[PDB]
Amino acid sequence: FVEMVDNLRGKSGQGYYVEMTVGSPPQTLNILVDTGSSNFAVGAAPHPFLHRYYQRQLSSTYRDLRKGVYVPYTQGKWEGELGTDLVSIPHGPNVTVRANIAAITESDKFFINGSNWEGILGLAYAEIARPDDSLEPFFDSLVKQTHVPNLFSLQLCGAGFPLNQSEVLASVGGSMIIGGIDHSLYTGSLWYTPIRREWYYEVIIVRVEINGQDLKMDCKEYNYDKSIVDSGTTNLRLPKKVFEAAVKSIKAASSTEKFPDGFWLGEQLVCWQAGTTPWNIFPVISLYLMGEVTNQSFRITILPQQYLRPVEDVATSQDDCYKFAISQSSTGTVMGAVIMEGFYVVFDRARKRIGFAVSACHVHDEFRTAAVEGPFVTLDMEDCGY
Numbered sequence: 001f002v003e004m005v006d007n008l009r010g011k012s013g014q015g016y017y018v019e020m021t022v023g024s025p026p027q028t029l030n031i032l033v034d035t036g037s038s039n040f041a042v043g044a045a046p047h048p049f050l051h052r053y054y055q056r057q058l059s060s061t062y063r064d065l066r067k068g069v070y071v072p073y074t075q076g077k078w079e080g081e082l083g084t085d086l087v088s089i090p091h092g093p094n095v096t097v098r099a100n101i102a103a104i105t106e107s108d109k110f111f112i113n114g115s116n117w118e119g120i121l122g123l124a125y126a127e128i129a130r131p132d133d134s135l136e137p138f139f140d141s142l143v144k145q146t147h148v149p150n151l152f153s154l155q156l157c158g159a160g161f162p163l164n165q166s167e168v169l170a171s172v173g174g175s176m177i178i179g180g181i182d183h184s185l186y187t188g189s190l191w192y193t194p195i196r197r198e199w200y201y202e203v204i205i206v207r208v209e210i211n212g213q214d215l216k217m218d219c220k221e222y223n224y225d226k227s228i229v230d231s232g233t234t235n236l237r238l239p240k241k242v243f244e245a246a247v248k249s250i251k252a253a254s255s256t257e258k259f260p261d262g263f264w265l266g267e268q269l270v271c272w273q274a275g276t277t278p279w280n281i282f283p284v285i286s287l288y289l290m291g292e293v294t295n296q297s298f299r300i301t302i303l304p305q306q307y308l309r310p311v312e313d314v315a316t317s318q319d320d321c322y323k324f325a326i327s328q329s330s331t332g333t334v335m336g337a338v339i340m341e342g343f344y345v346v347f348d349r350a351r352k353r354i355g356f357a358v359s360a361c362h363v364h365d366e367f368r369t370a371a372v373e374g375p376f377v378t379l380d381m382e383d384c385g386y
């Protein structure tokens, strides 16, 4: 899928987006790739943060559905008017699809300054779509109206250093492969975990390790409420009971240096002199995931290079600065973009599973690497879900 490769741009903190066209004649828009929602929505009115928007009155194929729509995210909400129109992906499958578009009229803390995207593509399932599950999500529409296979795969590729808008516009941010798996985007083997339920992309975490050390909690706590694979979230988000045990474990391993409480709350950056980031004092994190085979599991391992998110310095100096990108959740585990940055991720909707392999694009050093390994005959499993 050579024509599909390098079709993404962006970064964890501002989001990863793809180019799409909407309307007739085609209107070009950058669209945030969000596997943690199911609405396809674009800015349709002027906004300070938007350099362009969808103009329905200029599209001959636009269809007004005479329905309002409201989507509340965990942080952020927009309001809009439902319609349909022809939709294309210039660096995707060679197809045109008629899709539901929410034309965005009111916005609160949804759009992001400098992000360079004007809409959001909800890749999840109908069950969590607004107004209700009767509104067909884009991917469902695409698969029904075309011969594209019922799968997509994501390579989110973080720089390991801060990128300015000039660089984020010029840089390749990754690949979204629609309908296939591209072998050039990963090393090693793909391991599959089942989709528990087709609403969010929901998974089960069986075990959690920090530098090989079991956090030793009942497996249900790891999936308290739910656990999801979500490109529309920056951080690894952990249920409070898990989060607190993890931060204590990470703090204990990284003890040789001391960090402000606000770093651990994800709010303050820490800087080191250029090139001296002490990655070695920070632990790797392993998430064990339910296998397809009964009583089998595998693990995904990420480095501090995934969970310390590069940020530009307060005075923009030569220092290498980062934010701690693991945070508290009251709505379950969100395996966000910083974890996704470690792996090539296959959303195999047809076979109801999510695949993981080590990203050919992942940031590492000469001493440690991201890993996808198995199998482990861990016991319990089976009531790990909520």
Ligand SMILES: CCCO[C@H]1CN[C@@H]([C@@H](O)[C@H](Cc2cc(F)cc(F)c2)NC(=O)[C@H](CCc2ccccc2)N2CC[C@@](CC(C)C)(NC(C)=O)C2=O)C1
Residues within 6 Å of the ligand: 012, 013, 014, 015, 016, 032, 034, 036, 037, 038, 072, 073, 074, 075, 076, 077, 109, 110, 111, 112, 128, 230, 231, 232, 233, 234, 235
């Ligand atoms: C079906 C609806 C329910 O789905 C829920 C499960 N899936 C979630 C996503 O669909 C949603 C998409 C989305 C993307 C976007 F750019 C703007 C949006 F408003 C929504 N993301 C989120 O809501 C979290 C909230 C985190 C949070 C949690 C708690 C407190 C503050 C922030 N956000 C938003 C900003 C972002 C996004 C990044 C792309 C720039 N970055 C950072 C640094 O916070 C991130 O992580 C929602």
